[PDB]
Amino acid sequence: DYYHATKTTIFNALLNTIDLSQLAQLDLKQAGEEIRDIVAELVAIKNVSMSVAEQEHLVQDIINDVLGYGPLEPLLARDDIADIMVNGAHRVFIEVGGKVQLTNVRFRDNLQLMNICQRIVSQVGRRVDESSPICDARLPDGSRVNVIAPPLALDGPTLTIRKFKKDKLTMKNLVEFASISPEGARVLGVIGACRCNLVISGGTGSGKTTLLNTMTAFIDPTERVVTCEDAAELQLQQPHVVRLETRPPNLEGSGAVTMRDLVKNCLRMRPERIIVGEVRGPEAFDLLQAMNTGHDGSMGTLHANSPREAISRIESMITMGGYGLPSKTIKEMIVGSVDVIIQAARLRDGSRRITHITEVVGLEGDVIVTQDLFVYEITGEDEHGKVVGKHRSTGIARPRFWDRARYYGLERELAEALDAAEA
Amino acid sequence: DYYHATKTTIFNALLNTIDLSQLAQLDLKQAGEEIRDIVAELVAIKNVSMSVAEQEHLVQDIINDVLGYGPLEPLLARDDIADIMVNGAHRVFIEVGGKVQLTNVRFRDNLQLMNICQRIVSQVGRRVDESSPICDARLPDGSRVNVIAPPLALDGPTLTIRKFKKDKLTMKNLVEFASISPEGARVLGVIGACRCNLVISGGTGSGKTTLLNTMTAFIDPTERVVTCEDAAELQLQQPHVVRLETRPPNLEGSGAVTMRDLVKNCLRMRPERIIVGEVRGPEAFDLLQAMNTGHDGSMGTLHANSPREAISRIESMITMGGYGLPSKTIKEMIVGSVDVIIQAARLRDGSRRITHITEVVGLEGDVIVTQDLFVYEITGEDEHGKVVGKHRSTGIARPRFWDRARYYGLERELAEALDAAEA
Amino acid sequence: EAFDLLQAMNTGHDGSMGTLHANSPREAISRIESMITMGGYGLPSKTIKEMIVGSVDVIIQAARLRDGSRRITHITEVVGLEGDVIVTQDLFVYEITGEDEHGKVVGKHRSTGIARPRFWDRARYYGLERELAEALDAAEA
């Protein structure tokens, strides 16, 4: 009841005594203590229906106005809310238990919201205003903030926040959700630990990224990484990561940095796992060379259905590269670099499965000989509209990289998994 | 633990006495005197546990605050620090002889790191900002620096400085290091002493310049040599040498001396060999003229992965020159000029080898013909983790440049080396 | 922007929409391919068709009659990619019978009589399947 008018009076009185114009003076603690005392004194000096509880509340609200986020502080705190969505200064929604709901926490007006947004984003050296009404940011708490201003958004400043995620889609989620076998899971774990290159290919909707992220989660932390993504989608877990991104054409048809330049520049910064987001232009070439010159453990993605189609696509990309190499040298390079070409595909039942786990055995004539470590053999389709199969093995005694797995000190696990898969 | 707090206090005292807002006053020497004087006065009046050495360190820290590099200096001053990696404002890693770790040295604000990067690239007339967000450079002291800007790097600026090191390899030592087999060593000695227009290609981190120095160590003394470099790296061991270097554009971007102009002028100094430090632009054109109009022995290095890409890149550069030459003319010119291409590269396991020793044979329509004498054919990898190969020989009975070998009477030794290698 | 929109049709935002300028659903799909190629991402010409076959699930065509009136004409779907061409299974259509004594065009809204449309499986989730079956049956009668 008496919160609004009393808070307005406190704001006016404190501004008269010690306003924000004293910035750089009455440091955060100093201003907090002084404002608390001034509000306590004004509650009696001026008629204030705010009792002791309302007195502490007014002190807290003054702290918020001068310093804090105000109405978002509660929701930003609560642990049952993962995502917060503010549509104009009036309506705020929250994702509780995997579903959106409305809770009335209004802002004083649009100016307040458009100031809170800047105070939020600038915490990591950004700023959003009427000369750049878009903003996105990532924070130390694993969160991600996205802000749009009133020049575009009609309703009013629109904010979206996704707070900490901790249970990233680790392998066990893939396993138990009927998309990969256990022994295959251990084989993948070893393929990732042994810094053996890999390339991921999946039909439309196969979800290349999710898989690539699950794989990156394997790298040993001591290995410096450089992820040259197209849009900031990968969410790595290591301490040593280094992000990047491209830039599209400007209004004058210039000022663009295509991913080729980024992949070229990543060579300098002494990396040890040049991860990529997607391979469409000639960048393939550069990436492959990076795989060969002593960066054992890179990754990547591309669009193709069956692994052999993936190899053909890579060769087509390089040919589009405009370098004119013979059709044999390119194949030799691919056979020398790539070590596993995982697969991912979406089946008619709407699920998502890892159909193949293919290697690159070698070069023979004009055919790059490959062998498979696992495959997805369907058995039938159920009444509920599903497609069900099984992950079949091939009892292979030794892959091409067995020596490497012997080196990095995880030799047994590979054979244990491959042999026990027959169980 | 008094270092940080005392330093903050002394910085505040200096700012109150002489603040950075007084720019254009208290200049280089005036500052070097007044800052030290105020520091001594504060240390005398203001009890600081810092000693005379610590007092000098604090004085230098304030000097850095004024016009310095930021906290990089205490790192750079060391010798065990072989690499400095920034990755944003909040982290600085280092490698110390085989191991790598994090350090408890940090920056204050992305403004500090960004300004330090802009300054250190202004040392060699380079500027990195929101218009050209990428900058690679080599500082005069010898070490290499790379920097990426906020628009791409999502974590603010990212900067890497690689410690300088010296190789000075020799052809008699390369054989022990297993780079080139002794038969190859004799063949290359003949190829270098016989004034053969060659081009030493190389891939990322391959280490061309060492090879180029090792090769030029074969030149006969009296020959008047002329280089054209950008960093003053080489170390020629001949009495009659003339050295050179380009002068990048001034702060206003005017009066620049591009390697092209250096070459076009070296054409008039009566040189016998025009060595070049590297090939980046249309200067190749001029160099090719030097390769053709009676300056036999000109060398040079360009960044290419395999010879049949190096040729295409040379053609692309010449076309980019904007001369309007039809492509076929460019191919004719290259076929006429170049004589040998030595493609060196770094294999996966980190070693350095010489993979190709090729000779341009001629032109047949729209395809250039090459007759690789050697190829470092990969055989396998040992159990200890290092690859294994062998320098196979195609064993051409008489290479193209045989005539030259005759004119200098060295042909017999080349024939012996071929016979040994042919088997 | 069509490409980006297709991403939304793909990465679990099922329910996107859009509007574009065309006359014949095949012409509409050709226009979409042209738009995606405009971006210059370098995609081949078959992957674009794969993307458009895996993304879209209805292509409604509405038109203006020659006479000066508007009618809804096609409720075509997308069935798949057979080789290098896209296929359709137009559910409903509107056929121009002729003219009246005044001159206005006349016609009938007809259902080709397909039994289980492609999106039927999806409609199974939301318990609409019975309603769709009933409507198609009444049309077929």
Numbering used by the authors:
A (entry chain A), B (entry chain F): 80 to 502
C (entry chain B): 362 to 502
Can you provide the manuscript's text about this entry?
The bacterial tight adherence pilus system (TadPS) assembles surface pili essential for adhesion and colonisation in many human pathogens. Pilus dynamics are powered by the ATPase CpaF (TadA), which drives extension and retraction cycles in Caulobacter crescentus through an unknown mechanism. We show that CpaF assembles into a hexamer with C2 symmetry in different nucleotide states. Nucleotide cycling occurs through an intra-subunit clamp-like mechanism that promotes sequential conformational changes between subunits.
To understand how the absence of nucleotide might regulate CpaF assembly and conformation, the structure of CpaF was determined by cryo-EM without nucleotide addition but in the presence of Mg2+. In this case, CpaF was less stable yielding a map resolved to 4.0 Å resolution overall. Henceforth, this CpaF structure obtained in the absence of nucleotide is termed CpaFAPO. CpaFAPO formed a C2 symmetric hexamer with subunits arranged in an open, closed and open’ conformation like CpaFAMPPNP and CpaFADP. No nucleotide or Mg2+ was observed in the nucleotide-binding pockets although HEPES was bound in the CTD/CTDn+1 clefts in both open and open’ state subunits. Superposition of the three distinct NTD2/CTDn+1 units within the CpaFAPO hexamer showed close alignment with RMSD Cα ≤ 0.7 Å. However, comparison of the CpaFAPO and CpaFADP asymmetric units showed that whilst similar, they do not pack identically and cannot be considered equivalent to CpaFADP superposed on CpaFAMPPNP. Specifically, Hinge 2 within the open state subunit is straightened so that its NTD2 moves towards the neighbouring NTD2 of the closed subunit. Consequently, the nucleotide-binding pocket in the open state subunit differs significantly in comparison to CpaFAMPPNP and CpaFADP as the associated NTD2/CTDn+1 unit has rotated. The overall effect is a relaxed and more rounded C2 symmetric hexamer.
